[PDB]
Write an enzyme that holds these catalytic residues in place. Structure first.
Site, PDB file in Angstrom:
ATOM      1  N   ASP A  34     141.404 -43.328-107.263  1.00 48.33           N
ATOM      2  CA  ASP A  34     140.510 -42.631-106.353  1.00 48.33           C
ATOM      3  C   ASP A  34     140.392 -41.155-106.736  1.00 48.33           C
ATOM      4  O   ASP A  34     140.975 -40.688-107.715  1.00 48.33           O
ATOM      5  CB  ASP A  34     141.008 -42.762-104.914  1.00 48.33           C
TER       6      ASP A  34
HETATM    7  O1  LIG Z   1     136.544 -41.235-104.063  1.00 45.62           O
HETATM    8  P1  LIG Z   1     136.542 -39.738-103.868  1.00 45.62           P
HETATM    9  O2  LIG Z   1     135.465 -39.120-104.726  1.00 45.62           O
HETATM   10  O3  LIG Z   1     137.884 -39.183-104.275  1.00 45.62           O
HETATM   11  O4  LIG Z   1     136.235 -39.387-102.289  1.00 45.62           O
HETATM   12  C1  LIG Z   1     137.293 -39.044-101.442  1.00 45.62           C
HETATM   13  C2  LIG Z   1     136.811 -39.218-100.004  1.00 45.62           C
HETATM   14  C3  LIG Z   1     136.010 -40.517 -99.918  1.00 45.62           C
HETATM   15  C4  LIG Z   1     138.016 -39.292 -99.070  1.00 45.62           C
HETATM   16  C5  LIG Z   1     135.961 -38.015 -99.595  1.00 45.62           C
HETATM   17  O5  LIG Z   1     135.583 -37.304-100.738  1.00 45.62           O
HETATM   18  C6  LIG Z   1     134.715 -38.440 -98.817  1.00 45.62           C
HETATM   19  O6  LIG Z   1     133.651 -38.429 -99.340  1.00 45.62           O
HETATM   20  N1  LIG Z   1     134.837 -38.843 -97.430  1.00 45.62           N
HETATM   21  C7  LIG Z   1     133.686 -39.249 -96.646  1.00 45.62           C
HETATM   22  C8  LIG Z   1     133.974 -38.906 -95.186  1.00 45.62           C
HETATM   23  C9  LIG Z   1     134.877 -37.699 -94.953  1.00 45.62           C
HETATM   24  O7  LIG Z   1     135.599 -37.336 -95.815  1.00 45.62           O
HETATM   25  N2  LIG Z   1     134.859 -36.989 -93.689  1.00 45.62           N
HETATM   26  C10 LIG Z   1     135.722 -35.838 -93.493  1.00 45.62           C
HETATM   27  C11 LIG Z   1     137.173 -36.256 -93.286  1.00 45.62           C
HETATM   28  S1  LIG Z   1     138.175 -34.778 -92.955  1.00 45.62           S
HETATM   29  C12 LIG Z   1     139.926 -35.213 -93.136  1.00 45.62           C
HETATM   30  O8  LIG Z   1     140.280 -35.817 -94.088  1.00 45.62           O
HETATM   31  C13 LIG Z   1     140.944 -34.809 -92.073  1.00 45.62           C
HETATM   32  C14 LIG Z   1     141.775 -33.608 -92.515  1.00 45.62           C
HETATM   33  C15 LIG Z   1     143.196 -33.641 -91.958  1.00 45.62           C
HETATM   34  C16 LIG Z   1     144.116 -32.658 -92.677  1.00 45.62           C
HETATM   35  C17 LIG Z   1     144.040 -31.244 -92.108  1.00 45.62           C
HETATM   36  C18 LIG Z   1     144.720 -30.228 -93.020  1.00 45.62           C
HETATM   37  C19 LIG Z   1     145.609 -29.246 -92.261  1.00 45.62           C
HETATM   38  C20 LIG Z   1     146.737 -28.703 -93.137  1.00 45.62           C
HETATM   39  C21 LIG Z   1     147.367 -27.435 -92.569  1.00 45.62           C
HETATM   40  C22 LIG Z   1     148.184 -26.667 -93.605  1.00 45.62           C
HETATM   41  C23 LIG Z   1     149.470 -27.393 -93.992  1.00 45.62           C
END
Ligand SMILES: *OP(=O)(O)OCC(C)(C)[C@@H](O)C(=O)NCCC(=O)NCCSC(=O)CCCCCCCCCCC
Ligand SMILES: CCCCCCCCCCCCCCCCCC(=O)OC[C@H](COP(=O)([O-])OCC(O)COP(=O)([O-])OC[C@@H](COC(=O)CCCCCCCCCCCCCCCCC)OC(=O)CCCCCCCCCCCCCCCCC)OC(=O)CCCCCCCCCCCCCCCCC
Ligand SMILES: CCCCCCCCCCCCCCCCCC(=O)OC[C@H](COP(=O)([O-])OCC(O)COP(=O)([O-])OC[C@@H](COC(=O)CCCCCCCCCCCCCCCCC)OC(=O)CCCCCCCCCCCCCCCCC)OC(=O)CCCCCCCCCCCCCCCCC
Ligand SMILES: CCCCCCCCCCCCCCCCC[C@@H](O)O[C@H](CO[C@H](O)CCCCCCCCCCCCCCC)COP(=O)(O)OCC[N+](C)(C)C
Ligand SMILES: CCCCCCCC/C=C\CCCCCCCC(=O)OC[C@H](COP(=O)(O)OCCN)OC(=O)CCCCCCC/C=C\CCCCCCCC
Ligand SMILES: CCCCCCCC/C=C\CCCCCCCC(=O)OC[C@H](COP(=O)(O)OCCN)OC(=O)CCCCCCC/C=C\CCCCCCCC
Ligand SMILES: CCCCCCCC/C=C\CCCCCCCC(=O)O[C@H](COC(=O)CCCCCCC/C=C/CCCCCCCC)COP(=O)(O)OCCN
Lengths: 603, 103, 178, 88, 128, 459
Positions: free
Chosen positions: D43
């Site tokens: 991925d």
């Molecule tokens: O196949 P790839 O090209 O690698 O695609 C990866 C992926 C499919 C996951 C992504 O690029 C994508 O296109 N997703 C589609 C929907 C999407 O991603 N919507 C947003 C989701 S946001 C999320 O992941 C929640 C974040 C939680 C983490 C918060 C961070 C806080 C940390 C604080 C400091 C330590």
């Protein structure tokens, strides 16, 4: 005849020969660093003799050899004060410099300009000797500014890096703020005592007023990085590690405390300035230890330790114990320089990596550095019968039994606890865990230069306190009788700091994570002092320097007032006078009018 | 994602040229062609030329020029304790008042 | 650094950049390797629970609350590699970098040392002199009208050709010249 | 310093060493030219983690714009060599 | 929910906290594309002038010339006497002078009165 | 005094009868010889003066200025040799003639024993400078610059002439010795106030005083290098010398007439220094620094104490040498880059290390690092001002800090950082430029060994 004066002048004089030879053929070869190192070792050995003479008898001297000039009733001459302070500080500085030069011969091996670097170090040493042995205020100012210029040149060693140049200019700025007070004191003493010579200043000032002492305190706070003017010392870690170990650790930054020590006869006759010095030192040591407690760069931790130790020295000055402050200067030189050398050894062994997050198990991987740093941390925390004992323990006892601020005393004790705490932090995060450095292990201690340079200061930090304390005459009344709990206070607070720091550091292994608290953020960002005070004033200065001084006044209104108004008026008058149609009608009508006016006005 | 074919090809060509250029930075065994032309022992000479000569010059300057003027080299007066004797005069400083000694 | 930038970052690039930043700052918080491994696996699990979501609006509502949560807990003193733009040795060797054209100003007594080096240098100069005249026309005909749309450069397409605008990239000083 | 002059073979060996310790990919299947998404079925998050492991292994950071388009071990080796000025 | 970041003049807003980057419209994409296009055109011009073997001179930058000219010589012809400029000029150019005059005059009057009454103790004050 | 004046006059026929390719060599050699001859004026007495004749006399205030004037001419010739290569022989001879005439006028002005004679030569110095600025200047602003440099000066000096003749109708003499020995107090009167203003404003405008300084940046940035050197090093000090001479007949009015100027100086030195913090032109920055130093000299002269006068003399000499060196360094950059903008040519320490050392020494001297004579003058002035009023230290202290800042700023922007990539025409420094910097900087460090030579007649 009386080899004392000849020896004292010869030390400083032979310190200058490699500077003369810097244009000879030796400077273009690879033997120049060894030349400078050998010269410094010879100077240390020579300077050991007047110290023996003073130790035997108490020899003290003033040498006014060259007459510079005479402004009517004020005679300025080149004069050297070879007193207890000079003949005790010169050997220590030369010993530390010899160790640092031997260390730099290994540390800066791949630097193309190593000859220049060695030359710069010798120039700083010469300027610091000039500062320490000066007898008048002008010579002391010469040394004062020389060490600052050398600090600027050595901090910005890598001049292609923007941060190094910024840090060098920052050091210059803060020390100029202190220079204001230095110049104030010089002007006051010239105007009132008619002298810059120290003897006349001591004679004519039996009750010293506030202004010259406040100027001296401002200069000391500027050069020793007290709380108001503190951040430049941590910023000065941009320079190479030998520079940080020599100038900004043990030798150059104690210059403000030395200035306050030199003027102690005038300081004991003023109670307000003493209280100001006490409070400044207490707040400095507390704040800097608090900042050090959460730092991740090892050089930053050691720099904040140096700043807190300087604050403790100023506390000692404030309670009217100048000789104790001098003794602490001498001991701190040894163990702080050796601590910086150990940190630089680690940094070099880990491919110029300075973060303690990325150094793990080094207790077994590099044992000599481990033992040296352990002994240095024990000396810094005042372990009994070590070098730091004979100064720190006495200072703590003197502050405990004195008529002083309760708040300053409490802050000093808390700062001692925090000193134990950050020593624990360095040891725990650099030596005790599992390795956290990149897989290609290039760890290597086996260089005789590094080993010998570290080992000489190891022996110093073990025995010098005992030797020096037993070989100097008594200069104060001792604190013979004390309550038992008051006698143990330093040890108790050190043990409590050790235990609390160890307990808090052992919880980093637990599998739980939480976001930081407000107190941690305050401690990590240095009380937010560098942020606000490096963004609000500077901006408001620079903006004004363009908007009002340059554009509004110089380019607009000063231009509007004198030249532009003159041009406008003269051009309008020219248009008025010359715009005539050339018709004799109007000309002769005007002639008639002027004829009538001259007939009926001038008679 | 990844490189476009044009980006890939330009990178290979540029890196081949860069590797050639870096290889051309090495020196041949004869490259530093130096043109020659002229016109305890070390410690002994160092101690002679860097310690003995300066101390001779400084001692001469202090003993015969600096002290030729008054108050140029002013010494702190040596400490005198009871029971001492003076070389210049030869009198004996009287002892103290035989304080009651105990512990 | 080497790659030309685009006009904008897509949603996927922004998500991946957040993932890298969050993992790095979590490593800075969790000093030990096993603790970091555990919490990084937890963060990976938290990150891909919305991996399969389809609509753009809420997927953009996420990665906004994620940025806010990151900025609240971002470890104000994160670990920086020493050569990285915030590291302790970022521009340390910048003062040892000297341009190649300075060698044209050397005295003949200096160029007398290193004759092989300067012969190779002359070869390089003549190669550059021919390739430039070819490259100018190649770029002139390969460019769309109205000017370039992206600062990306083409490769060489003929046999004796060289990539256009190659001299100052190939003749970089070095990473550690002295 | 005293840093040995790493070579292209060393860079390739270390890259493959780090990749073989990634239990997501089979050590038999991967090669220098084996693609990440198509040849090994990985991925984008896996690619980010692989880049981070490379950065930790070699002690320097790869910018995200460059790192996002490194899809084979061979191009990782080439990027490291170009950054660190490796001759052979 | 987490405590909010409040931007200031000397601590600006992070790009990851900008709502403007989450309000994507076709017009925004077109603006970004044409901004990149003009940047690319300028870069191509500079790099064509920079890699040329024949050139042996400093490359002239019209933007730098415009900056220096605007900072130095375009000031006065665009100056207009307004209440704001008049008031700021009067304040910043006159107020400090009279403030310092008052301070120094008061100090010297105090010193002169003390000298005339004889209670100043200027002993050893020989050099002036 | 004619042993110096006659050879300076003989420089002109020697220049005009010289070969086409030997003008610079002969001019430089004979100017250096004249400087060596003028070195003998330094032997001064603690008594009155060296009264050679009824027309000329020398003092320990005039002797260092004369030595500086004679020493500056060979340096100006060396600096002008470069950019005048493609000029016809007749015009090069005219340039050298202008420089020689300026030196002659300055020599006579410093040693003149009569106020009217002093005024005539003090104005005669204008014509060569105006011709040099408006003829061999580079940009189109030079014409405007010249106009400013003229009219400001004249606007100050026409009243002085009036006052001067008025004085000679009242005292009967304008000889400085008689004027000093027969001095009488000035009563507080409106007529006396306007006489004071007439006697003071001409020298104030040429220092220049803050608020009357608008001509100086124009003139200094538009002049050729030799013009900038002579303007910053010598022509500014004419006002200081004149005010030092003329204040003997202005007492006790100066006790309260000095207040508006003192403020204008004490605040002014701040403003100009802050102006140096935001400047995009090197020459403009150096000119504004000159304004700040001369504001300090104005304060010293208005305080009217022995330490003030000593500090003012020392600071005048030190600033002359330092500003000339800084202008020469800026010009040596300009002749390579042709821009005169600070941030264009960067990281020059990597490409020109010895010139970087010259830059460092010049910046350190301008920063007043002890024991330079710059700091000697500054400290004497500061001590005198502190005696005048203890509050002054604040402003003085601030200036010190600001000065260091901008000085190091100029050193960091041009010498440190990364070199500009597209600038590939920076050739190795010539022996002429290095010798020019060495001949600027060695006299300063030599003078720090015998400061009594530059401390004036009140030492
Ligand atoms: O196949 P790839 O090209 O690698 O695609 C990866 C992926 C499919 C996951 C992504 O690029 C994508 O296109 N997703 C589609 C929907 C999407 O991603 N919507 C947003 C989701 S946001 C999320 O992941 C929640 C974040 C939680 C983490 C918060 C961070 C806080 C940390 C604080 C400091 C330590
Ligand atoms: C008289 C009787 C004598 C006996 C006294 C009792 C004996 C001892 C009892 C113990 C008492 C406390 C000792 C423990 C210290 C605290 C440890 C702790 O819990 O920290 C974790 C905890 C949270 O940390 P975290 O977020 O989890 O960190 C993330 C990781 O841990 C990141 O971790 P990391 O790996 O990055 O680094 C870890 C680091 C990071 O930890 C930190 O963040 C540092 C902050 C905690 C240490 C600060 C202590 C110094 C106090 C000085 C205060 C002076 C006044 C300042 C006033 C401020 C005003 C705003 O922590 C440490 O290194 C160790 C901490 C210090 C332990 C060693 C020394 C402690 C003993 C010394 C003090 C007492 C003995 C003195 C001896 C003399 C005898 C009296 O910190 C706190 O919550 C702070 C607790 C106390 C702070 C009080 C200040 C609050 C002020 C708010 C405002 C109030 C109103 C004001 C209004 C004003 C109007 C004008
Ligand atoms: C300190 C004692 C020295 C005794 C030995 C003799 C010293 C002779 C000094 C001669 C006068 C300065 C000459 C300046 C022009 C340099 C020409 C040149 O390009 O040389 C290249 C030559 C060959 O190098 P390269 O391979 O071409 O260099 C390549 C790059 O350019 C790379 O070049 P670089 O990075 O090597 O740059 C040169 C280097 C050095 O270059 C300079 O900075 C020269 C200017 C330094 C001073 C700046 C003005 C400050 C005010 C001074 C006023 C006092 C003057 C005294 C009388 C001077 C008579 C000339 O830069 C620095 O290290 C910074 C110097 C900062 C000094 C801060 C402290 C100054 C005051 C010290 C106290 C003095 C009075 C003490 C009174 C109380 C005790 C008695 O290297 C040298 O010759 C360097 C000489 C070492 C520096 C001497 C600094 C100490 C002497 C200061 C003045 C004389 C003091 C006499 C009493 C001493 C007791
Ligand atoms: C523009 C850039 C700067 C240029 C240089 C500026 C420096 C020149 C400033 C002139 C110095 C001051 C001039 C007069 C000072 C005398 C003191 C007097 O003015 O103060 C009071 C005088 O009161 C009032 O000032 C009366 C005069 C009021 C009218 C004068 C105009 C006021 C402002 C004008 C400023 C314009 C300057 C620019 C002109 C183009 C004292 O009261 P009094 O005891 O009774 O008079 C004492 C004098 N006696 C003994 C001769 C009688
Ligand atoms: C070296 C190798 C040569 C060895 C042969 C010489 C051996 C010693 C014989 C020297 C003869 C004595 C001598 O030097 O003459 C005295 C002569 C002084 O002349 P006087 O007129 O008596 O006093 C000055 C007022 N007019 O002494 C000297 O000049 C030499 C000693 C000077 C000290 C060293 C100076 C170094 C510092 C340079 C100045 C720095 C700036 C000033 C700082 C002032 C600080 C307050
Ligand atoms: C009562 C009478 C008082 C007389 C005062 C004489 C002042 C001396 C300068 C007079 C110049 C007036 C003429 C003038 O400047 O015209 C505006 C002119 C228009 O340009 P032109 O060259 O004429 O045409 C170009 C297009 N073909 O604008 C300029 O160039 C201005 C540049 C010259 C000004 C230089 C500075 C002069 C003022 C300095 C202050 C001194 C003022 C003297 C009197 C003040 C009172 C004591
Ligand atoms: C850079 C531009 C500066 C321009 C020059 C500013 C200085 C102006 C000084 C005044 C100008 C005239 C000076 C007079 C010459 C001195 C002679 C003298 O003092 O005699 C007085 C005469 O004094 C006067 O008449 C002066 C009157 C003023 C007339 C001219 C006005 C010029 C402008 C005045 C205001 C500006 C002055 C300050 C300007 C500050 C800088 C802008 C006494 O005359 P008696 O009648 O014989 O004796 C009295 C007993 N029976």
């Amino acid at each position: 005849m009386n080899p004392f004066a000849s020896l004292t002048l010869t030390t400083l004089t032979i310190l200058t020969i490699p500077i003369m030879m810097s244009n000879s053929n030796i400077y273009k070869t690879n033997l120049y660093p060894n030349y400078v190192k050998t010269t410094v070792s010879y100077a240390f050995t020579l300077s050991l003799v007047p110290l023996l003479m003073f130790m035997h008898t108490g020899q003290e001297m003033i040498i006014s050899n060259w007459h510079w000039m005479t402004l009517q009733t004020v005679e300025l001459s080149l004069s050297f004060k070879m007193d207890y302070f000079s003949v005790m500080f010169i050997p220590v500085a030369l010993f530390v410099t010899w160790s640092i030069m031997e260390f730099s011969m290994w540390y800066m091996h791949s630097d193309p300009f190593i000859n220049r670097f060695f030359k710069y170090l010798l120039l700083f040493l010469i300027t610091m000797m000039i500062l320490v042995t000066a007898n008048n205020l002008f010579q002391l100012f010469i040394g004062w500014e020389g060490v600052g210029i050398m600090s600027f040149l050595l901090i910005g060693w890598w001049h292609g890096r923007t941060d190094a140049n910024t840090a060098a200019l920052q050091a210059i700025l803060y020390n100029r703020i202190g220079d204001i007070g230095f110049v104030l004191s010089m002007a006051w003493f010239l105007t009132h005592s008619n002298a810059w010579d120290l003897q006349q200043i001591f004679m004519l000032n039996n009750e010293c007023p506030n202004m010259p002492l406040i100027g001296l305190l401002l200069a000391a706070a500027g050069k020793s990085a007290q709380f108001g003017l503190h951040p430049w010392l941590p910023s000065a870690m941009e320079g190479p590690t030998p520079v940080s170990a020599l100038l900004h650790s043990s030798t150059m930054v104690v210059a403000g405390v030395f200035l306050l020590i030199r003027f102690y006869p005038l300081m004991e006759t003023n109670k307000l300035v003493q209280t100001m010095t006490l409070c400044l030192g207490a707040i400095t040591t507390l704040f800097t230890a608090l900042c050090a407690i959460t730092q991740n760069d090892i050089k930053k931790i050691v720099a904040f330790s140096t700043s807190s130790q300087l604050g403790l020295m100023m506390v000692t000055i404030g309670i009217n114990q100048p000789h104790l402050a001098f003794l602490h200067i001498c001991m701190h030189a040894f163990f702080k320089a050796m601590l910086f050398m150990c940190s630089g050894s680690i940094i070099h062994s880990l491919n110029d990596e300075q973060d303690i997050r990325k150094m793990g198990g080094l207790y077994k991987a590099m044992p000599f550095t481990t033992t040296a740093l352990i002994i240095g941390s024990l000396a810094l925390t005042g372990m009994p019968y070590l070098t730091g004992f004979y100064s720190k323990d006495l200072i703590i006892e003197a502050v405990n039994m004195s008529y002083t601020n309760a708040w300053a005393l409490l802050m000093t004790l808390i700062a001692t606890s925090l000193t134990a705490a950050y020593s624990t932090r360095i040891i725990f995060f650099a030596f005790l865990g599992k390795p956290r450095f990149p897989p290609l292990v290039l760890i290597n201690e086996n260089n005789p230069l590094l080993i010998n340079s570290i080992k000489r200061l190891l022996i110093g930090s073990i025995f010098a306190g005992f030797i020096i304390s037993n070989n100097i005459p008594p200069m104060t009344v001792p604190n013979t009788t004390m309550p038992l709990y008051m006698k143990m206070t330093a040890l108790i607070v050190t043990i409590m700091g050790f235990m609390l720091a160890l307990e808090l550091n052992n919880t980093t292994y637990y599998l739980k994570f939480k976001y930081p608290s407000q107190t941690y953020k305050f401690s990590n960002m240095l009380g937010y002092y560098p942020s606000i005070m490096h963004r609000l004033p500077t901006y408001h200065n620079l903006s004004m320097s363009q908007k009002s001084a340059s554009s509004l006044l110089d380019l607009i209104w000063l231009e509007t007032i004198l030249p532009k108004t003159t041009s406008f008026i003269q051009m309008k008058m020219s248009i008025m006078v010359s715009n005539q149609k050339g018709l004799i009608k109007l000309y002769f009508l005007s002639f008639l009018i002027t004829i009538m006016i001259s007939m009926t006005l001038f008679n | 994602s990844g490189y476009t074919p044009d980006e890939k090809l330009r990178l290979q060509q540029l890196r081949e040229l860069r590797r050639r250029w870096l290889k051309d930075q090495e020196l041949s065994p004869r490259e530093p062609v130096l043109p020659p032309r002229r016109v305890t022992y070390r410690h002994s000479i160092f101690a002679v030329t860097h310690v003995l000569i300066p101390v001779w010059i400084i001692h001469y300057y202090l003993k015969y020029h600096v002290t030729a003027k008054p108050y140029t080299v002013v010494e702190r007066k040596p400490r005198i304790f009871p029971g001492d004797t003076i070389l210049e005069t030869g009198e004996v400083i009287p002892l103290m008042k035989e304080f009651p000694d105990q512990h | 650094a080497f790659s030309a930038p685009a006009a904008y970052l897509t949603h996927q690039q922004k998500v991946l950049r957040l993932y890298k930043r969050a993992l790095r700052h979590l490593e800075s918080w969790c000093v030990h390797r096993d603790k970091y491994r555990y919490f990084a696996c937890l963060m990976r699990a938290r990150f891909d629970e919305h991996k399969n979501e389809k609509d753009m609006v809420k997927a953009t509502q996420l990665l906004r609350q994620a940025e806010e949560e990151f900025w609240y807990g971002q470890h104000p003193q994160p670990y920086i590699f020493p050569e990285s733009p915030g590291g302790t040795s970022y521009e340390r060797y910048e003062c040892y970098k000297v341009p190649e054209w300075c060698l044209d100003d050397w005295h003949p007594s200096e160029k007398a040392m290193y004759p092989d080096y300067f012969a190779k240098r002359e070869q390089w100069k003549r190669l550059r002199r021919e390739s430039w005249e070819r490259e100018v026309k190649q770029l002139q005909e390969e460019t769309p009208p109205g000017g370039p749309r992206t600062e990306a450069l083409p490769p060489a397409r003929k046999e004796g050709d060289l990539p256009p605008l190659w001299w100052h990239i190939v003749t970089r000083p070095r990473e550690r010249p002295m | 310093s005293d840093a040995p002059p790493l070579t292209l073979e060393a860079i390739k060996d270390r890259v493959l060493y780090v990749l073989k310790l990634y239990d997501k990919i089979d050590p038999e299947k991967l090669s220098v030219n084996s693609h990440f998404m198509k040849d090994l079925g990985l991925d984008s998050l896996d690619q980010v983690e692989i880049i981070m492991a490379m950065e930790d292994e070699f002690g320097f950071e790869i910018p995200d714009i460059d790192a996002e388009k490194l899809m084979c071990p061979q191009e990782i080796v080439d990027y490291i060599a170009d950054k660190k000025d490796v001759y052979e | 929910s987490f405590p909010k970041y409040k931007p200031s003049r000397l601590a600006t807003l992070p790009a990851t906290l900008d709502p403007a980057e989450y309000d994507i419209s076709p017009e925004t994409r077109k603006a970004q594309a044409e901004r990149l296009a003009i940047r690319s055109r300028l870069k191509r011009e500079y790099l064509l002038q920079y890699n040329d073997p024949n050139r042996l001179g400093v490359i002239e930058d019209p933007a730098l010339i415009r900056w220096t000219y605007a900072r130095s010589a375009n000031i006065y012809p665009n100056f207009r006497p307004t209440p704001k400029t008049s008031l700021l000029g009067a304040l910043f150019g006159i107020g400090p002078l009279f403030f310092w005059y008052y301070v120094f005059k008061t100090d010297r009057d105090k010193k002169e009165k003390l000298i005339q009454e004889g209670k100043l103790d200027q002993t050893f004050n020989i050099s002036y | 005094m004619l042993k110096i004046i006659i050879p300076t006059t003989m420089l002109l026929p020697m220049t005009w009868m010289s070969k086409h390719n030997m003008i610079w060599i002969n001019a430089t050699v004979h100017s250096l010889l004249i400087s060596l001859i003028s070195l003998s004026l330094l032997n001064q007495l603690g008594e009155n003066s060296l009264n050679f004749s009824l027309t000329f006399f020398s003092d320990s205030l005039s002797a260092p200025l004369l030595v500086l004037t004679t020493w500056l001419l060979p340096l100006m010739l060396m600096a002008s040799q470069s950019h005048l290569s493609k000029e016809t022989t007749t015009r090069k001879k005219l340039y050298i003639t202008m420089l020689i005439l300026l030196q002659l006028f300055l020599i006579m002005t410093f040693t003149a024993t009569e106020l009217i004679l002093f005024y005539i030569l003090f104005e005669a110095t204008l014509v060569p400078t105006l011709i040099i600025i408006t003829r061999w200047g580079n940009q189109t602003e030079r014409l405007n610059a010249g106009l400013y440099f003229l009219f400001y000066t004249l606007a100050g000096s026409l009243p002085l002439l009036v006052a001067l003749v008025y004085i000679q109708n009242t005292t009967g003499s304008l000889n400085f010795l008689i004027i000093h020995y027969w001095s009488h107090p000035l009563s507080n009167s409106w007529s006396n106030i306007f006489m004071w203003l007439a006697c003071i404003m001409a020298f104030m405008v040429k220092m220049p005083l803050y608020g009357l300084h608008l001509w100086l940046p124009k003139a200094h940035v538009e002049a050729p290098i030799a013009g900038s050197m002579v303007l910053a090093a010598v022509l500014l000090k004419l006002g200081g010398y004149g005010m030092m001479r003329i204040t003997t007949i202005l007492n006790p009015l100066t006790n309260y007439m000095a207040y508006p100027f003192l403020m204008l100086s004490m605040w002014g030195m701040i403003m100009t220094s802050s102006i140096c913090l935001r400047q995009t032109d090197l020459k403009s920055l150096i000119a504004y620094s000159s304004v700040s130093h001369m504001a300090l000299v104005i304060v010293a002269i208005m305080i009217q104490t022995p330490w003030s006068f000593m500090g003012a003399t020392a600071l005048m000499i030190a600033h002359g040498l330092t500003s000339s060196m800084l202008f020469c360094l800026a010009n040596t950059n300009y002749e390579r880059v042709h821009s005169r903008t600070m941030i264009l040519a960067r990281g020059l320490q990597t490409l020109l290390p010895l010139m970087a050392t010259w830059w460092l020494v010049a910046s350190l001297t301008n920063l007043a690092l002890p024991p330079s004579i710059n700091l000697i003058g500054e400290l004497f002035i500061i001590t005198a001002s502190f005696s005048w009023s203890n509050i002054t230290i604040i402003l003085m202290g601030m200036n010190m800090m600001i000065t260091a800042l901008y000085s190091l700023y100029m050193l960091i922007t041009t010498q440190r950082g990364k070199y500009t990539h597209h600038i590939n025409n920076i050739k190795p420094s010539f022996t002429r430029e290095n010798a020019l910097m060495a001949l600027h900087i060695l006299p300063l460090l030599l003078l720090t060994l015998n400061p009594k030579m530059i401390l004036g007649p009140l030492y």
